[PDB]
Amino acid sequence: YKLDVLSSVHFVPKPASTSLEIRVETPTISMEDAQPLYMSNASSLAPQEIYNVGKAEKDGEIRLKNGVAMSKEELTREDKNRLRRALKRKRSKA
Amino acid sequence: AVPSVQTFGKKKSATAVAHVKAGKGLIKVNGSPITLVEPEILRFKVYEPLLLVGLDKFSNIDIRVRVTGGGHVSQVYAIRQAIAKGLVAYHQKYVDEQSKNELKKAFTSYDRTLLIADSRRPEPK
Amino acid sequence: SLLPPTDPFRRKHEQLLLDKLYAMGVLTTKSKISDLENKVTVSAICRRRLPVIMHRLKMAETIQDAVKFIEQGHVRVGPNLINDPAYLVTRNMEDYVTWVDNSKIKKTLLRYRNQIDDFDFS
Amino acid sequence: LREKAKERNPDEYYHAMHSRKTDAKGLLISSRHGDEEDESLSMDQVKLLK
Amino acid sequence: RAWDLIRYRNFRTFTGTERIQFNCLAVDPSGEVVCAGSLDNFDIHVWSVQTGQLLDALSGHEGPVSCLSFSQENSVLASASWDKTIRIWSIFGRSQQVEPIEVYSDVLALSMRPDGKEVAVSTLKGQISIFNIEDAKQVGNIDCRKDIISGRFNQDRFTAKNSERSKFFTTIHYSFDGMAIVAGGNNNSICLYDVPNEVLLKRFIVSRNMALNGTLEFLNSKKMTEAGSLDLIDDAGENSDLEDRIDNSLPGSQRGGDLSTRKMRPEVRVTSVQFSPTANAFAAASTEGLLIYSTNDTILFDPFDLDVDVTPHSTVEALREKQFLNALVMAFRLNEEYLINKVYEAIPIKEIPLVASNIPAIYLPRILKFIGDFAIESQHIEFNLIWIKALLSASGGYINEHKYLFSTAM
Amino acid sequence: MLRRQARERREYLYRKAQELQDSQLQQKRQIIKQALAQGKPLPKELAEDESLQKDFRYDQSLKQVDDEYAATSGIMDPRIIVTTSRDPSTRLSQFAKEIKLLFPNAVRLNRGNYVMPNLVDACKKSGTTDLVVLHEHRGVPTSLTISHFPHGPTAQFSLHNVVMRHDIINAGNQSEVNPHLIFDNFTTALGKRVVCILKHLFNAGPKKDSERVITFANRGDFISVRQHVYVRTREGVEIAEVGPRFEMRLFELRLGTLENKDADVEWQLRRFIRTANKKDYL
RNA sequence: GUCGACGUACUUCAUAGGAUCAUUUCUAUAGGAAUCGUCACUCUUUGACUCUUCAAAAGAGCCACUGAAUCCAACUUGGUUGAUGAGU
RNA sequence: GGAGCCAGCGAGUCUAACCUUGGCCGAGAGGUCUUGGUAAAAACUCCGUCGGGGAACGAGGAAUUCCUAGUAAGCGCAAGUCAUCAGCUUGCGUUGAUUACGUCCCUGCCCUUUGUACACACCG
RNA sequence: CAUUGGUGAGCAGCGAAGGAUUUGGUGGAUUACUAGCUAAUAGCAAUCUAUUUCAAAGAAUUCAAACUUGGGGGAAUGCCUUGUUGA
Secondary structure, three states, X not given: OHHHHHOOOOOOOOOOOOOOOOOOOOOHHHHOOOOOOOOOOOOOXXXXXXXXXXXXXXXXXXXOXXXXXXXXXXXXXXXXXXXXXXXXXXXXXX | OOOEEEEEEOOOXXXXXXXXXXXXXEOOEXXXXXXXXXXXXXXXXXXXXXXXXXOHHHOOEEEEEEEXXXXXXXXXXXXXXHHHHHHHHHHHHHOXXXXXXXHHHHHHHHOHHHOOXXXXXXXXX | OOOOXXXXXXXXXXXXXXXXXXXXXXXXXXXXXXXXXXOOOXXXXXXXXXXXXXXXOOOOOOHHHHHHHHHHOOEEEOOEEOOOOOOEXXXXXXXXXXXXXXXXXXXXXXXHOOOOOOOOOO | OHHHHHOXXXXXXXXXXXXXXXXXXXXXXXXXXOOOOOOOOOHHHHHHHO | OOOEOOOOEOOOOOXXXXXXXXXXXXXXXXXXXXXXXXXXXXXXXXXXXXXXXXXXXXXXOOOOEEEEEEEOOOOEEEEEEOOOEEEEEEOOOOOOEEEEEEOOOOOOEEEEOOOOOEEEEEOOOOEEEEEEOOOOOEEEEEEOOOOOOOOOOOOOOOOOOOOOOOOOOOEEEEOOOXXXXXXXXXXXXXXXXXXXXXXXXXXXXXXXXXXXXXXXOXXXXXXXXXXXXXXXXXXXXXXXXXXXXXOOOOOOOOOOOOXXXXXXXXXXXXXXXXXXXXXXXXXEEEOOEEEEEOOOOOOOOOOOOOOOOOOHHHHHHHHHOOOHHHHHHHHHHHOOHHHHHHHHHHOOHHHHHHHHHOOOOOOHHHHHHHHHHHHHOOOOHHHHHHHHHHHHHHHHHHHHHOHHHOOOOO | OHHHHHHHHHHHHHHHHHHHHHHHHHHHHHHHHHHHHOOOOOOHHHHHOOHHHHHOOHHHHXXXXXXXXXXXXXXXXXXXXXXXXXXXXXXXXXXXXXXXXXXXXXXXXXXXXXXXXXXXXXXXXXXXXXXXXXXXXXXXXXXXXEEEOOOOOEEEEEEOOOEOOOOOOOOOOOOXXXXXEEEEOOOOHHHHHHHHHHHOOOOOOOOOOOOOEEEEEEOOOOEEEOEEEEEOOOOOOEEEXXXXXXXXXXXXXXXXXXXXXXXXXXXXXXXXXXXXXXXXXX
């Protein structure tokens, strides 16, 4: 700090940086400053943040990410085969 | 001192030096009056700045132009640019700024190659 | 130094400081961290100062004359001029130090080269 | 010489630029005389010599 | 960094590739492309917004690139750089090509018109030029040097008549109609201009403050004595406290940290300017905070096509004699806010469709402005709603033709 | 700008000078590393010294792509501009087109009415990595000059046994996949220089299953280039040659740009020496 | 092709004696020369001061009042019976 | 046929042919004279004149190749740089164009088919 | 021949009992103008001293106090702290 305010803060900056920052839900009114008005009113969390649809809890059922739940009991076997292939290409990337 | 001013003009590979000083109302280009530039179809292009502005402002001054290098059309564009920037500089130095500005507006509205040249550097992709 | 040698904290931090000083201008050679310890001089910082940069780039003639010129206001750093004579300058502004246009200095220079171009009223 | 010509550094100010002068060709002119006073005799001195 | 004003969080942080420091930023009208430029590596970086990578590294400005902006209505990028150059990049349309334009001196300020066709650039040589952008010719320039009041620093050695620390322009902006320019430099003054007649309107001196340096331009022979100008005499010892005695100032500190680190006085310079989209106010951010200048047609009186008969008396008389179109037209011709407010609050709803339809085109901007002000500080929400509904349904397409003519009142 | 590159070359040359005079110092520090690693006699000069044994804390804390390429080896995929000599010939035009096709990230430049310094400075202003300029004789291509632009190095090769692809056969079109490279029998530091310049001349970061191979083999100081497409059979993987073939041979190497003509010669082919026939690489 | 054993070639080291100076007396030796209330002159060195060259750049700026110096014009006086100039 | 007038790289006590005709001088070696024949800025502008070839040939088919501005083309001057080039090769200047600057429809080429990246939006 | 080099002889034109240049001292300006001194609700201003003395008012860190030190090493004797010996 003292070196830069000495030397007219034009420098070449710090190379690369990563650190996880947590966030908590307390709405935007308490997030903003101390003043007799307000500016934004929704929560500081997104709907996708507080809940995305999780991967399926029980074992004989399949939850996709777009909210259509299936079971291994109501499936025709060709669609069973299709679902296995889709999971195959997903785990093939991952 | 003698109230004087000096400028340069430049096409692709030629040079046009223009001295402008107070005088009796004449033109001289390479020790020869300007009714005798060579190419004889671009003589009017040399004449262009005078005929753009008027004639009295060139009735009360003295020009001396010397050009080197280049070919025909290059020299000619060089002389016209030199005369333009020299007249504008003399007006800026010794007479009113308002006259300089109206001169500059009339010139650049006509054709900007008079006041700034373009040395053509290429564009590689 | 008092830290143990093979810590990546130690290595990365010392190298980052060497980047900072080499871009700052005080120390010349980036490799000897001994020369971090031993070459860092007030002489080096004060020669990174403005008027020594003028005597470097052969703008002025000697350093006292450069101080006269910067005090009199003829020399600009990039787009604005400088009046505080004790300016520090890194390499990336050493690139842009120059004389101000329509100064009698630049007039004298281009007159001696016979190239004053008074459309710019330089 | 060519490498100096590469790094000309076109901003310098040497005070001899007030006393030296230059041809339009670029070459630096110099005097047959050398001095700073015998550039041209004046009319008194020419009266005396004549 | 991006910043969302709804959940208050920098959702994306875009970076450089060898980590250079930045100076200017510009964004596509669609929140899709963010481009930035520096003064250390003179290459315009540009990121996609949808993913936090950097798309590309636009190149071609030798020396630093200082100002950027966008022509939105055809979406081109304008760069302005100390190369003495203006570049215009077309970055879409699967050509990705250039067009350069030279300017006599090193440019350092840039703005676009809302028509996207004219770019106002400001030099260092005090000129403010204005280009047509489709073809490269120079449409209109204004010399603007002489009416710039620079101060003389107490630490200087020259005069303000010879100085050149402030005889230029830092920042430009266009007014939204397309007629007026605000221009502000490191001087003491903001200048306000008209573009078509190319003659300035006014000079504004920002702060008549002895404490700052660059306000006065003639200092006092009383003050300067035979040892120094008396304001370079440190009085830290005079203070009756240690926190006021000591400093931390480092030699030649400029642009850094607090002001205690400076054994010099804080200089005054208009740093940035912009008009208001919502009224003819304009704001100037300077070293003492924010200034905002507005208008008041209640305090002025610039009427329009008068006559011997049109008069507050005759207007009130025609109002009580119930020819509401005539009452409204008279009050608009007199342009007194109180008469306008009187007729606007007294006329009834069962004449509103006819009256709104048969207001004429020259007075449409004035009536839109007044409805804006009165509504945002009034209490008749339903009434002002009925007016705006009738006016829009009456002359909607006409506004759509002269979009730029009503683009500041809507 | 141009001033920035000028003082850049200044600082690079100064760092080279300091590197030379600190080589021996690096040797002495390595020796002291080995002594502390195993207690042994310490020899005469470094034993008697005081400054070395004092400053060896930072030094113990101290500790490969060539330096002209060092910052941008495998991050920004290079861009190359290939241009023809002067008032081109038609056979040369076809062959330079073939070279442009052979490399990726390549663009072609006809040259009439140019000069070398204006071209090179315009290319630097534009921002371009690497440059190739071709010279021929009577239709036959014979000479090639490669430059790396931020005052990088240039190499000049001759090239002889050329055959155009169309004059092999009227075959079809290439795939232009990011190719692969094989480098055979390279020995010397010069060899490392040339494999470095050619590796940074190609594209950076290819795939795992790319199907075009480009070879580089030293066969008696005549770098033979070929190019084949391969498709992996079960037992004998078949290679189909495509793209031109030619015998390439180094003859000079400058440490400046090609417009200089008086930079630092870091190698130059000696011809009329007594052992010219004798050595390899010399 | 690397490494062990031999053989062979090569690079590298000591120093002693005596003198002196260094502790606000005294380097350890008695073999060695040094104590004071200044009076004048000359010489020499080193700078402050005012100007200034090589050779500049910038002006605490405006107006008024009262002084000076310089150069022209004008006047007086001296001057072809010789004014100016010019190394016994 | 005149006449007008315009460039740029380049400078190592270094830059250069052949045979033939004879006189005289000298011991020659050869020297000198004499004599005949063969290899090695331009376009521009202006004025004045004129209006098939010594048997192939009157601007060069089918196919095929390339190119989007100081580019195609035209005109010359210089050098001859440890690889190549003298049947030529490379420099430099002059003059300076028409037509595209959009498209995936054909020809081919590639990439992606999993939002993964953190808002709003969009799809699912 | 041009000189945008130096000097020096004369005009054309400008023109009211002179013109051109330089330089010192001083006055008024250079932030928006309520009068001087003191022991000050008054007095002085030719001077406060032979009323200018009394009474009242009032004493915490039981002494808290370098926020200030160029960087690496140590400090005999001093200095600070900590314990201890004897009056």
